[PDB]
Design a protein around this ligand. Structure first.
Ligand code: ME8
Length: 509
């Protein structure tokens, strides 16, 4: 029962949630659930990042106070995650009181280590990215200043702000990345982060004067904290900071994994660790940056109205079918395309057929031909034993894949096994054998059928992280109790004589 603390990046509630958000929550819910089934004590944090201009500007364009849009749109994210069956332990909002408190304390410590200082800032702020750029990192295109990287507009900003002594931590960071090879995944993202930090870091503005929407800097009410300082702090707040001598913080911090997307990696792999080093806090163990998801182009909303609502998509296709597609279509870490044709055919071949047809055809035979009881198998032939051996070795393989955030390869391995089982079912042809008078073929019918059920049972157990309801539905159909559904149950075979209730379809769609 070792602790495992796993977090998602928290979303700006400035707009409705797109599929990219639901991708991050689903991948992380898969990891969370796998760990619970594998006997870890999981704390799973998600939520919203309610401060900053980006949110304040969306409020004024609506014609409403900022805190109103914050609570309303935060509820939409929360309700969306309920629908997608995200098993978060806490949903953190940055307006929360204890969060305000956690941030003040983090600042107090960075002050107390001599890493915050007042100075004049001049430069370009992108409200859409909540982030500063130097003039070199912007282009003038038809009389409009856009960032070179993202193509987003920028604002000239002259203010007096508190800075963080980020340049002091360049080599301590490089030391850390070197000593902890698995701190940043995937490996492509690691070498990018190492490139940037080797170029040298400049000090970082961490307060704002021009607006009041945010956590006030302690002993300087005239300032609010840069939204990213307070936002990163949510991970500390999710484990009971500032009370560092509490059960939660002692148990769960340091976080075992931050799931984020590749655009916010610098905040998590450079700025966040430096703040923590400054404040004398233990760093997180690992950061996995997942790739973007397109609609044949990045989803642009207004530029191209090609957004994909995951709640619509979940009602359109089923929650579990969407969670399977997102974790199967794309290799986790790389960029990928969503398309309406790709998902339907994926759901059709992988779930409707390879999995669900195999289950219905075996579970129906049990109901018709065997009085709805699990059969007693005899001596397993070599083809039976080879199928049972691949399936008995899945838990180890899938476990390895989940520990590198390669959920896609776990699913591939589980489906290569199902593909063997279908071929096995075709070549053993039990539909022939059930209609026979000799007791040899009747025992042989009972054996083949038992194997197919025992294989499907294993698949169901291992698919619980990705498809909780549909996995559970199959385990119901195989007569499994509510205490025989953890990964310990993978090792314990399907007992002959169990009553299987009358087959209903797992994927009515
Ligand atoms: C202390 S963390 C605060 C983070 C900050 N609050 C923030 O970044 O706000 P956010 O609401 O835009 O968060 C979006 C998250 O979803 C991913 N993402 C977004 N769109 C995506 C897409 N189309 N495809 C794939 N991934 C996507 C993206 O990488 C990011 O991780």
């Amino acid at each position: 029962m070792k602790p495992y603390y796993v977090t998602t990046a928290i979303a700006y509630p400035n707009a409705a949630p797109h599929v990219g958000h639901a991708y991050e929550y689903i991948a992380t819910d898969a990891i969370a659930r796998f760990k619970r089934l594998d006997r870890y004590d999981v704390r799973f944090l998600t939520g919203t990042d309610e401060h900053g201009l980006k949110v304040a500007q969306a409020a004024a364009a609506a014609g409403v106070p900022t805190a109103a849009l914050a609570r309303r749109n935060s509820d939409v994210f929360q309700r969306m995650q309920e629908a997608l069956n995200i098993s978060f332990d806490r949903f953190i909002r940055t307006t929360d009181a204890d969060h305000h408190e956690a941030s003040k304390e983090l600042w107090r410590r960075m002050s107390a280590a001599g890493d915050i200082y007042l100075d004049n800032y001049s430069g370009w702020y992108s409200v859409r990215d909540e982030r500063f750029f130097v003039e070199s990192e912007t282009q003038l295109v038809d009389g409009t200043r856009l960032t070179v990287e993202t193509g987003t507009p920028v604002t000239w900003t002259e203010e007096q702000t508190y800075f963080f002594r980020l340049s002091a931590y360049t080599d301590k960071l490089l030391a850390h990345y070197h000593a902890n090879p698995d701190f940043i995944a995937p490996e492509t993202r690691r070498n990018e982060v190492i490139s940037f930090v080797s170029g040298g870091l400049d000090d970082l503005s961490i307060s704002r004067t021009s607006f009041d929407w945010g956590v006030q800097v302690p002993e300087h009410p005239d300032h609010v904290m840069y939204v990213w300082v307070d936002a990163l702090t949510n991970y500390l707040t999710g484990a009971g900071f500032p009370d560092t001598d509490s059960e939660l913080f002692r148990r769960y911090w340091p976080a075992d994994l931050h799931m984020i997307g590749k655009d916010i990696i610098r905040f998590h792999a450079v700025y966040w660790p430096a703040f923590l080093m400054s404040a004398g806090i233990e760093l997180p163990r690992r950061i996995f940056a997942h790739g973007f998801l397109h609609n044949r182009g990045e989803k642009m909303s207004k530029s191209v109205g090609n957004i994909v609502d995951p709640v619509a998509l979940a009602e359109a296709l089923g929650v579990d079918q969407v969670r399977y597609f997102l974790l199967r279509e794309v290799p986790f870490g790389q960029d990928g395309s969503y398309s309406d044709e790709a998902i339907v055919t994926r759901i059709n071949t992988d779930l409707a057929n390879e999995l669900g047809n195999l289950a219905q055809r075996s579970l129906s035979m049990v109901a018709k031909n065997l009085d709805g009881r699990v059969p007693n198998p005899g001596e397993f032939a070599d083809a039976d034993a080879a199928l049972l051996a691949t399936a008995d070795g899945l838990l180890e393989r899938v476990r390895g894949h989940f520990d590198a955030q390669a959920m896609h390869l776990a699913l591939e391995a589980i489906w290569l096994m199902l593909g063997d089982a279908n071929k096995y079912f075709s070549v053993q042809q039990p539909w022939v054998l059930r209609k026979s008078e000799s007791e040899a073929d009747q025992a042989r019918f009972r054996t083949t059928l038992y194997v197919t059920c025992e294989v499907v049972r294993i698949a169901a157990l291992l698919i619980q992280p990705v498809m909780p309801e549909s996995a559970g539905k199959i385990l119901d159909l195989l007569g499994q109790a509510p205490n025989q559904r953890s990964f310990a149950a993978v090792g314990v075979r399907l007992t002959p004589g169990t009553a299987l209730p009358p087959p209903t379809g797992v994927f009515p769609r």
